[PDB]
A paper describes a structure:
The structure of PSI3-IsiA18 from [name] was determined using Cryo-EM to an overall resolution below 2.8 Å. The structure is consistent with previous reports with the canonical organization of the PSI3-IsiA18 supercomplex, a trimeric PSI surrounded by a ring-forming 18 IsiA protomers. Each IsiA protomer coordinates 17 chls and 4 carotenoid molecules. Each of the IsiA-IsiA interaction interfaces occurs over a large solvent excluded surface area of ~1600 Å2. In contrast, the IsiA-PSI interactions are much weaker, occurring in <1% of their total solvent accessible surfaces. These interactions take place mostly over two patches: (1) the PsaF/J subunits with an average area of around 1100 Å2; and (2) the PsaK subunit with an area of around 300 Å2. Accounting for the heterogeneity in the data set reveals a surprisingly large conformational space consisting of changes in IsiA-PSI orientations and connectivity. Structure based calculations showed that rapid IsiA-to-PSI energy transfer is always maintained, and even increases by three-fold in rare conformations via IsiA-specific chls.
Numbering used by the authors:
A (entry chain Q): 3 to 143
B (entry chain O): 3 to 70
C (entry chain P): 4 to 141
D (entry chain S): 1 to 39
E (entry chain N): 2 to 81
F (entry chain G): 367 to 439
G (entry chain H): 13 to 751
H (entry chain U): 5 to 53
The structure:
């Protein structure tokens, strides 16, 4: 319920501080736009937006929409980095392709990473994502 | 095992235990470790600050599992 | 031990009280010409022509100079003999122990420290917990 | 010119090319759309 | 005095003896490798323990080992 | 203040020394033959999965906890 | 004497795309991640790349040209930011009210708050480099003149880039051209320094002196005549200086006292600006110019007259020193590292001399009342000069490992230094223990006695006094120097020795600096910490080849980790590791020097001036009673004066608040590399390699932990990056706040 | 001439015969100090120390 | 209060990570498969094999003491 978190539209600490919001960019109304945007959040006793991350879809834009947007991009960086590393491993000189990146091969993989979650599920089902424990270098216990 | 045969190192003390290697030569002279195995990953070997290790080690028949 | 000392002006890196109380080390080599060698104590000394007798504090100092006699000189002095000198007058011939340099295999040498197994086939420390002996020992 | 293409495709240059382009995205997105604490 | 042990994975390329600065190691005849020689350690009383032999060993894991044991004047590398 | 800080600093010593003697256990007193396939051997068996996931959790926590503090600074 | 080789190295990009080609062990390609780090460590090690000294010296000459192109671009950037993004025209109208600023930040993510009000409506980063004070002393009036220097800096940088390519790929000089050191010293004393000082004395007389005399008279910067107008029309020039109309005839007929109106030995400071008189500096530079052009005729090159530097070194032998300086000429004409060790030692000493001279004789107008500029310029040139002194101990030890030949080094000074290594070091070891107990233990006695409520038992001015009587006598001799031992000097060399208090804008330019018990103790602290930094680096040079521990360290190299755990442990025995330990002690030495500087200026020099002549200081004279104790250094210096860096958030100085915490982090990040070691980290990576092998994302370039030297190199880099950035943000936020 | 030589003839003992360590004045002062004076019993040379 | 528990969680997990890796690699590792032969507390195995600074299981007690104090700090 967050009884100790008043909304920022009815928070007197935020209302006395939103009129003195500074401009972060060259726009002279940057502090006014931030005052209207942060009014919909939940504020504490010091009039700053406290974010709720527990899983409520009312506060889905606090963490879940950052979570969905991050994991897509971070999955994209990991998947095209993994797929480039697999492709250059089959070449004559796999070592030199890491310090001297085959840039046309890199752009080909990086634009193909928009369908990484469908490619990750399919490669997990095919067994080419996860290696078996018998086929991996192992410490001597 | 012939030259070019792919083996997996079952010798636990080695750097390549669980890694795949390629048989380079087998010595027919009664050697305790007659099978020379070449690897694509060098080991830790060398002084501190060295950019590479050694990719070759001699093994016996009991320490190799057939892969290819 | 016979040999003239190399012409050296003296140094503070040389022998200490251990040389005349516990042990000191002597290196004896025959020089072809009057050359300049780096002392392991710091500084440059000049070889006397013929036999040379140099007293050093450690066996490592005699062998660092002996390594310098092998590879840093064009005539390639390869007959240096290294002795351990005791204060009781005992002179013990150390290197080479059989007259042949140890990187060359020699007949009559006996295997010391050789183990007829791998390092990974050493016994566990739990099986010899109260015996004194190490896993590499027994 | 071919080795100039190889030098421009080296690991220091391409990570400085990408991070400049990544900072080029993020600064410009926070210039036209600043102050985004949440969605 | 330290313990210098040589195991049967020796290939006999004599690199431990050439890296030895204290004349601890030497090559004895042997029948277990192609070079027909194994390193031995008859002079571990002069062993300082600096492990230059283990750096020079090319086999995997190590065909020569130095185990640091009791410290004497010789093994502590003291000129005094 | 003195009572809380004393008991936490003592408990920090006791926790690290617990894993320290946990490591003296594997060095000295551990038998892989008698502990074959039990819960102690299997901790050694997937020790690479244990260390890398603890390395993941520490990096997952530390990149963000410092990252949110440096953001807030 | 000129001997070049026609096109030795072809110009192509084939080696640009093949990294590691310069080293034989890196040309085979990477196998581990150590190859990437070895690519950067060995990139400029030209002696390790090439055994030919001629090809080594050719790489060195062209790398100098490329380095000068970097400095000229950096110089051009400072003049371009002064021309385009600065209030220099605004500052030139009101130097006492407008703060200097030459960096404007873009408005993004709230960082536009750093564009503080520096006066006149301008908003930007308040600069502390002193460039505005330098340009006013150069006569810079309009921003177009700063812009033309910025274009000319890029032209000079392009010519530095062209001459680097020309002298490596087209016409590279031979080894005999490089080894003609008598020609090089004749062309650098009489050339670079002598004509450069003569050119600047010509600039100062014709440009700097008339413009600054009019700017101090009250003439607006719009109404100043241009520098070429003084050259073209000498009627304005003779109006400012009446004996200028006699022309060059009093110069050639030795009637030099005609020029005494603009070539003065005034001394002291200009009361209008607080800087040195440009009549003094032009007469300084001309007297400097005559001496180096005279001194650049000392050495014999082609025409018979002159000195052979070999024959000077051959003659200087004594009874204590054997053969003397014999063979040092062959050392310094064959070893580049031996010359670099001398040049880093003296340039590092020179930059410390520059810092120690520029605060007490401030050479620029309105510099001495900018307490931020005075604190920054002292601190920057202390840190630069201390880093170079550590590099002297580096390339001293690199020469001993690599280029020391004992065949041509028998019984000379370098042979005999090696022969009594235990005599030098153990006495240097003793004098560090004596100074450490008798400077720091004085503080510990003071810290204990003040804690026990015994102020009479302390070492202070109200207790057991330790007066620096020899420095007070030298200070007294300098105050009595005008009229007695410098009779033609109207004022003292500096008011730091004693005498007048100079006020410019209601702020002290310079006061007498009275040295008491606190100044005695902190100078012996400085004498202690310099001696340890000398102890670590001299032992690194002397014991680079051998010791009683490891007698074959010359074969091991200059930069090696150790010789194993044997002999108890030979950890950090290399000459590199003494540079590694010397960098910490240089940080420890210089941080106390700039802390002694920052406290003694604010407590006993800097402050505001009452109209009747009274001076109140920034920290109200707390150096005499609190700089005798570690707690006073903790409380009244560190805790009190960092209130400005921690309350700076939400203001223009909040970037200093960010960077003060930023350096605290990199300090703590260093101790991961310093305290730990790579066999933990290699054992940690190989579990992360397993999780990459689990998902088939293990790289072909095998991930390795850093080498032992690189683990020390990263840790000493972050410790000194973290520590200096902390002090930089502490000094800059405090000294912009005060005044 | 040359006032620094080998200490007592041997150049491989780690010491040097210097004007501080092995001068004529040094040997007649150090050797005539109580701890080194010839013929003194330890009770008198302890007493004078 | 939220951020500092995650610093505490970072402090506990990283201190556990050094300690568990010290315990699980106490018998050996790929850099040193004979750490049980060398005991719990040994300096190193020389600068060979790339360098083996602080490779012992005692040296992970050493490193986690800093992290335990940092967590307790
Ligand atoms: C650490 C414990 C924990 C974790 C792992 C979760 C996890 C989650 N919470 Mg949650 N929550 C928690 C405790 C927890 N919560 C607590 C203590 C509260 C405060 C009262 C809530 C309040 C909360 C609400 C009210 C909602 C979530 C919901 C969600 C789900 C996210 C929606 C989705 O697509 O999931 C896949 C997921 C199951 C949402 C959901 O879908 O519920 C089923 C939802 O509406 N949670
Ligand atoms: C763990 C990493 C972390 C997280 C989760 C965020 C997340 C965010 N940062 Mg950031 N920030 C961080 C690290 C972090 N930061 C650090 C390391 C710094 C110091 C360099 C900053 C300094 C910073 C500033 C100064 C700004 C952001 C802003 C933001 C927002 C980005 C909106 C966008 O571009 O779309 C978002 C709330 C912007 C924002 O909208 O703030 C709410 C903004 O102005 N960040
Ligand atoms: C302002 C945004 C911000 C910033 C600057 C970072 C920055 C980073 N995060 Mg992070 N994170 C954020 C928001 C942010 N995060 C949010 C909103 C979430 C909640 C979902 C997370 C959750 C998250 C995860 C789950 C992980 C990261 C990771 C990373 C680090 C490595 C980069 C990476 O994974 O890409 C390169 C990509 C890869 C190497 C492949 C990783 C696979 C991704 C995570 C998809 C996995 C799907 C399940 C990097 C320091 C990693 C980390 O902390 O290191 C341990 C990681 O595991 N973060
Ligand atoms: C402020 C100090 C500090 C920092 C941040 C680190 C950082 C870390 N420690 Mg620790 N460590 C420290 C001091 C510190 N430590 C000291 C004093 C010791 C005692 C010797 C150790 C002992 C130690 C051990 C023994 C272990 C750690 C581990 C690690 C990781 C912990 C997981 C984590 O938080 O990662 C996430 C957070 C970070 C990496 C911090 C972010 C760093 C920067 C700010 C962001 C990166 C971008 C950067 C700016 C790019 C550089 C560009 C620049 C060149 C211009 C990480 C590398 C463990 C590890 O590596 O396992 C995973 C490990 O086993 N450390
Ligand atoms: C006139 C200056 C001068 C010159 C000509 C050289 C020349 C050289 N030095 Mg150096 N030296 C000097 C000053 C100088 N030095 C000083 C000031 C120091 C004290 C620190 C030393 C200490 C020293 C040592 C300790 C070593 C050398 C060595 C080298 C050689 C190769 C360097 C190389 O390739 O690594 C290039 C490597 C780098 C450029 C990486 C350094 C990066 C630093 C740590 C961080 C940069 C600081 C930066 C401002 C902070 C921001 C970082 C980031 C945010 C961007 C070469 C002969 C090496 C050698 O073996 O000699 C034969 C070596 O081991 N020198
Ligand atoms: C565009 C013309 C050009 C090209 C194609 C070459 C080509 C060659 N030169 Mg080079 N050279 C040039 C101009 C050029 N040079 C100039 C301008 C200089 C003066 C510094 C020299 C001086 C010189 C030296 C002293 C050496 C070479 C050598 C080399 C070879 C390899 C260089 C390498 O590894 O590159 C890859 C590396 C880089 C491209 C460096 C990247 C930039 C670094 C960080 C330096 C940046 C500072 C820069 C000089 C000035 C900054 C400009 C300013 C505007 C910011 C190759 C045959 C080397 C060799 O092995 O010859 C046998 C050798 O020792 N040259
Ligand atoms: C009067 C003649 C003259 C002058 C002006 C200089 C000046 C210079 N020489 Mg040079 N030198 C000369 C003749 C001269 N030399 C002769 C005859 C010899 C042969 C015996 C050399 C041999 C030589 C070597 C081998 C080196 C120098 C270097 C340099 C620079 C010194 C350091 C520096 O950056 O200065 C400050 C720079 C300036 C004030 C900029 C001056 C702009 C132009 C050059 C005027 C400087 C550009 C070093 C250098 O940096 O190479 C580029 C270098 O490696 N010189
Ligand atoms: C490298 C420095 C240098 C340069 C190029 C100049 C340039 C100039 N000087 Mg000179 N000047 C200089 C150093 C220099 N000076 C110094 C150091 C002194 C002190 C001895 C003077 C004192 C001086 C006087 C007193 C006069 C000049 C004058 C002149 C001009 C006439 C020169 C000629 O031969 O006709 C010329 C523009 C004359 C002139 O007309 O100036 C405008 C003149 O009256 N100069
Ligand atoms: C006064 C002390 C002084 O510096 O004398 C300097 C003294 C001068 O020796 P020489 O007369 O041999 O010097 C000839 C010089 O040209 C150096 O080669 O040299 C030493 O005794 C060095 C030892 C100083 C150690 C203290
Ligand atoms: C953490 C640590 C490691 C692990 C560190 C490693 C393996 C290096 C990590 C390097 C990362 C991948 C990049 C470092 C940051 C770069 C300098 C950033 C470059 C610029 C970017 C924008 C690309 C050691 O190897 C080590 C060795 C010896 C003593 C102490 C330590 C030690 O403390
Ligand atoms: S540690 Fe050194 S002295 Fe001992 S056996 Fe090995 S190489 Fe020889
Ligand atoms: S122990 Fe290693 S270095 Fe010595 S002979 Fe055997 S293989 Fe060669
Ligand atoms: S650096 Fe590491 S391996 Fe080398 S001596 Fe020191 S502790 Fe041993």
């Amino acid at each position: 319920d967050f009884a100790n978190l008043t909304p920022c539209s009815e928070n007197p600490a935020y209302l006395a501080k939103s009129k003195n919001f500074l401009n972060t960019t060259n726009d002279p109304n940057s502090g006014k736009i931030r005052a209207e945007r942060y009014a919909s959040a939940l504020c504490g006793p010091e009039g700053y937006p406290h974010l709720i991350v527990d899983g409520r879809f009312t506060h889905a834009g606090d963490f879940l929409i950052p979570s969905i947007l991050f994991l897509y991009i971070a999955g994209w960086i990991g998947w095209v980095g993994r797929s480039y590393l697999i492709e250059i491993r089959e070449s004559k000189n796999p070592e030199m392709q890491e310090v001297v990146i085959n840039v046309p091969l890199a752009i080909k993989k990086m634009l193909g990473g928009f369908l990484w979650p469908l490619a990750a599920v399919g490669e997990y089902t095919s067994g080419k994502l996860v290696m078996k424990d018998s086929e991996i270098p192992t410490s001597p216990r | 095992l012939n030259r070019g045969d792919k083996v997996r190192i079952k010798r636990t003390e080695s750097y390549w235990y669980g890694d795949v290697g390629t048989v380079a030569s087998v010595e027919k002279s009664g050697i305790l470790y007659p099978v020379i195995v070449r690897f694509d990953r060098v080991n830790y070997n060398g002084f501190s600050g060295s950019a590479s290790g050694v990719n070759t080690n001699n093994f016996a028949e009991n320490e190799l599992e057939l892969v290819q | 031990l016979s040999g003239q000392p190399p012409k050296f002006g003296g140094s503070t890196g040389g022998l200490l009280s251990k040389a005349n109380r516990e042990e000191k080390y002597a290196i004896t080599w025959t020089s072809a010409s009057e050359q300049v060698f780096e002392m392991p104590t710091g500084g440059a000394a000049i070889m006397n022509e013929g036999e040379n007798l140099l007293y050093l504090a450690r066996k490592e100092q005699c062998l660092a100079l002996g390594t310098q006699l092998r590879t840093k000189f064009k005539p390639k002095i390869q007959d240096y003999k290294i002795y351990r000198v005791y204060p009781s007058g005992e002179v013990q011939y150390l290197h080479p122990a059989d007259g042949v340099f140890p990187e060359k295999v020699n007949e009559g040498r006996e295997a010391q420290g050789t183990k007829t197994r791998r390092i990974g086939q050493n016994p566990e420390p739990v099986t010899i917990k109260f015996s004194g002996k190490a896993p590499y020992e027994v | 010119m071919d080795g100039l293409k190889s030098f421009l495709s080296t690991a220091p240059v391409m990570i400085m090319a990408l991070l400049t382009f990544t900072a080029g995205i993020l600064i410009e997105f926070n210039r036209f759309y600043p102050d985004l604490l949440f969605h | 005095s330290h313990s210098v042990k040589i195991y049967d994975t020796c290939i006999g390329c004599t690199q431990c003896v050439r890296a030895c600065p204290l004349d601890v190691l030497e090559m004895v005849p042997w029948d277990g490798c192609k070079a027909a020689q194994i390193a031995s350690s008859p002079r571990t009383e002069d062993c300082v323990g600096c492990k230059r032999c283990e750096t020079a060993c090319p086999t995997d894991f190590l065909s020569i080992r130095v185990y640091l044991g009791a410290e004497t004047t010789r093994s502590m590398g003291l000129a005094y | 203040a003195a009572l809380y800080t004393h008991h936490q600093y003592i408990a920090g010593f006791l926790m690290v020394g617990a894993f320290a003697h946990g490591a003296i256990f594997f060095v000295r007193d551990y038998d892989p033959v008698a502990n074959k396939d039990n819960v102690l051997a299997r901790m050694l068996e997937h020790k690479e999965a244990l260390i890398s996931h603890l390395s993941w959790v520490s990096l997952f926590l530390g990149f963000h906890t410092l990252g949110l503090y440096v953001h807030n600074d | 004497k000129v001997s070049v080789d026609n096109n030795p190295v072809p110009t192509s990009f084939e080696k640009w795309g093949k990294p590691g080609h310069f080293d034989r062990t890196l040309a085979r390609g990477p196998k581990t991640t150590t190859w990437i780090w070895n690519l950067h460590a060995n990139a400029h090690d030209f002696d390790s790349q090439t055994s030919d000294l001629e090809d080594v010296s050719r790489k060195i000459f062209s790398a100098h040209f490329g380095h000068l192109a970097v400095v000229f671009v950096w110089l051009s950037g400072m003049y371009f930011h002064g021309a385009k993004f600065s209030n220099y025209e605004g500052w030139l109208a009101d130097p006492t009210h407008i703060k200097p600023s030459a960096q404007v930040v873009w408005p993004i993510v709230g960082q536009g708050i750093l564009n503080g009000d520096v006066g006149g409506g301008f908003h930007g980063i308040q600069i502390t480099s002193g460039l505005f004070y330098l340009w006013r002393a150069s006569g810079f009036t309009d921003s177009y003149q700063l812009y033309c220097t910025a274009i000319g800096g890029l032209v000079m940088a392009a010519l530095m880039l062209f001459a680097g390519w020309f002298h490596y790929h087209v016409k590279a000089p031979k080894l005999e051209w490089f080894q003609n050191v008598e020609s090089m010293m004749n062309h650098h004393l009489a050339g670079l320094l002598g004509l450069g000082s003569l050119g600047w004395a010509g600039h100062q007389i014709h440009v700097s002196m008339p413009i600054n005399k009019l700017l101090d008279a009250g003439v607006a910067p719009k109404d100043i005549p241009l520098p070429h107008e003084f050259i073209l029309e000498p009627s304005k020039m003779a109006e400012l200086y009446p004996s200028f109309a006699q022309g060059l005839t009093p110069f050639f007929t030795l009637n030099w006292g005609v020029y005494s109106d603009f070539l003065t030995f005034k001394g002291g400071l200009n009361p209008v600006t607080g800087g040195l008189w440009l009549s003094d500096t032009a007469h300084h530079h001309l007297a400097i110019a005559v001496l180096f052009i005279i001194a650049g005729h000392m050495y014999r090159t082609n025409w018979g007259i002159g000195h052979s530097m070999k024959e000077i070194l051959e003659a200087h032998k004594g009874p204590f020193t054997g053969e003397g300086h014999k063979g040092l000429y062959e050392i310094l004409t064959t070893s580049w590292h031996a010359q670099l060790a001398i040049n880093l030692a003296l340039l590092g000493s020179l930059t410390i001399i520059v810092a120690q001279h520029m605060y007490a004789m401030p050479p620029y107008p309105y510099q001495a009342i900018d307490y931020a500029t005075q604190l920054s310029l002292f601190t920057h040139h202390m840190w630069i000069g201390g880093f170079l002194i550590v590099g002297a101990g580096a390339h001293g030890a690199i020469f001993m490992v690599r280029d020391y030949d004992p065949a041509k080094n028998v019984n000379n000074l370098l042979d005999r230094m090696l022969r009594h290594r235990d005599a030098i070091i153990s006495h240097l070891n003793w004098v560090c223990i004596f100074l450490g107990f008798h400077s720091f233990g004085l503080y510990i006695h003071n810290d204990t006695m003040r804690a026990l409520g015994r102020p009479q038992d302390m070492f202070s001015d109200t207790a057991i006094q330790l007066q620096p009587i020899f420095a007070q006598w030298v200070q007294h001799l300098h105050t009595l120097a005008p009229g007695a031992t410098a009779p033609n000097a109207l004022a003292t060399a500096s008011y730091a020795f004693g005498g007048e208090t100079i006020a410019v804008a209601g702020k002290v330019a310079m006061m007498p600096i009275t040295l008491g018990t606190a100044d005695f103790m902190v100078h012996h602290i400085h004498a202690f910490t310099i001696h340890v930094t000398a102890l670590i680096l001299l032992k690194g040079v002397l014991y680079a080849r051998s010791s009683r521990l490891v007698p074959d360290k010359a074969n091991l190299g200059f930069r090696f980790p150790c010789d194993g755990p044997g002999r108890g442990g030979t950890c950090q025995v290399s000459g590199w590791d003494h540079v590694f330990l010397g960098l910490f002690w240089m940080y420890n030495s210089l941080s106390i020097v700039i802390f002694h500087f920052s406290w003694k200026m604010q407590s006993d020099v800097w402050g505001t001036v009452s109209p009747d002549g009274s001076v109140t200081h920034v920290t109200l004279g707390n150096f005499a009673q609190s700089a005798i104790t570690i707690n006073g250094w903790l409380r009244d210096f560190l805790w009190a004066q960092a209130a400005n860096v921690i309350n700076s958030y939400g203001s223009a100085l909040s970037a200093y608040g960010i960077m003060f915490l930023a350096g605290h982090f990199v300090f703590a990040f260093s101790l991961m590399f310093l305290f730990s070691g790579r066999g933990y980290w290699q054992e940690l990576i190989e579990s992360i390699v397993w999780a990459h092998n689990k998902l088939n994302v293990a790289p072909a370039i095998q991930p390795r932990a850093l080498s032992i030297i690189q683990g020390r190199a990263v840790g000493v880099a972050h410790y000194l990056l973290g520590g200096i950035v902390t002090t930089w943000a502490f000094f800059l936020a405090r000294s912009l706040s005060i005044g | 001439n040359q006032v620094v030589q080998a200490y007592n003839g041997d150049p491989f003992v780690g010491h040097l015969s210097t004007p501080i360590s092995d001068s004529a004045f040094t040997r007649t002062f150090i050797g005539n100090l109580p701890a080194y004076r010839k013929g003194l019993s330890p009770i008198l040379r302890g007493l004078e120390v | 209060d939220f951020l500092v528990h995650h610093a505490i969680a970072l402090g506990l997990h990283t201190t556990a990570l050094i300690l568990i890796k010290g315990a699980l690699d106490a018998r050996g590792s790929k850099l040193m498969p004979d750490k049980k032969d060398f005991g719990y507390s040994f300096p190193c195995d020389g600068p060979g094999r790339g360098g083996t600074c602080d490779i012992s299981a005692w040296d992970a007690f050493y490193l986690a003491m800093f992290w335990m104090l940092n967590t307790l700090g």
